[PDB]
């Protein structure tokens, strides 16, 4: 196992964890630190701050990391453009 | 019918066209101008230049409008972050 957080990529951790669904449909491997962040639903806030792709929810203005598999399940693409939190879209 | 391009929204056009799949699974209505842009695969280049969400393909650096239903079918979310054109990912 290797942690699938590119900025991390450790092979040693006190405990392995699971992350997002891969394009294979299988579930990514994360180290204890990165996996804890993912479970907290703050993976992209913690690791992808500098990256391109951030938009704002159309209703609450929460920052949403688009074009990113790690946040895919929490972002709704809206019918006429833009994105919403799963809360605010549904 | 009303063109589902928010910057447009006309109700009069010489010819109606179809756009992206809606979250209902049905297919959006676009006027002749916006629909032509969509068929050309340059809708987001033509209308969403100023918007947030643009990333670069991990391999060819093409600009890809993420968090956007109009480009959803042309963008692959990669297993470890970032995006690729359908060409470069597959
Ligand atoms: Zn890690
Ligand atoms: Zn992210
Ligand atoms: Zn929201
Ligand atoms: Zn139009
Ligand atoms: Zn777009
Ligand atoms: Zn590409």
Q: How many domains does the structure of chain A reveal?
A: 1
Cβ of residue B78 closer than 8 Å to a chain A Cβ: yes
Tell how far CA A71 is from the center of its chain. 3
Q: What are phi and psi of A67, to 5 degrees?
A: 60, 35
How was this structure determined? It was done by X-ray
When computed from its CA atoms, the radius of gyration of chain A, rounded to whole angstroms, is: 14
Per the listing, tokens 């109009």 go with: B70
Yes or no, beta carbons of B23 and A79 under 8 Å apart: yes
Which residues on chain B are in Cβ contact (under 8 Å) with A4?
79-80
| Resolution value in angstroms | 1.8
Ligand nearest to the CA of B14: 4
Residues in chain A: 90
Cβ of residue A68 closer than 8 Å to a chain B Cβ: yes
As to burial, measured by CB atoms within 10 angstroms (0-12 exposed, 13-18 middle, 19+ buried), residue B31 is buried
Map residue B12 onto helix, strand or coil. coil
The CA-to-CA distance between both ends of chain A, in Å, stands at 36
For B45-82, give one letter per residue: b (16+ CB within 10 A) or e.
eebbeeebbbbbbbeeebebbbbbbbbeebbbbbbebb
Which residues on chain A are in Cβ contact (under 8 Å) with B52?
54-56
B64, B67, B86: best to mutate for the A interface, most A CBs within 10 A:
B67
Domain membership of residue B20 as a residue range: 1-90
Per the listing, tokens 């109606």 go with: B16
């Amino acid at each position: 196992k290797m942690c699938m957080n590119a900025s991390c990529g450790t092979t040693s951790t006190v405990e392995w964890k699971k992350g997002w669904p891969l394009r294979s449909g299988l579930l990514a491997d994360l180290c204890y630190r990165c996996g804890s962040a993912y479970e907290s639903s703050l993976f992209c806030e913690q690791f992808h701050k500098d990256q391109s792709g951030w938009r704002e929810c159309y209703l609450c203005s929460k920052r949403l990391h688009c074009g990113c598999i790690a946040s895919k399940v929490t972002i709704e693409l809206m019918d006429y453009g833009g994105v919403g939190c799963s809360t605010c879209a549904c």
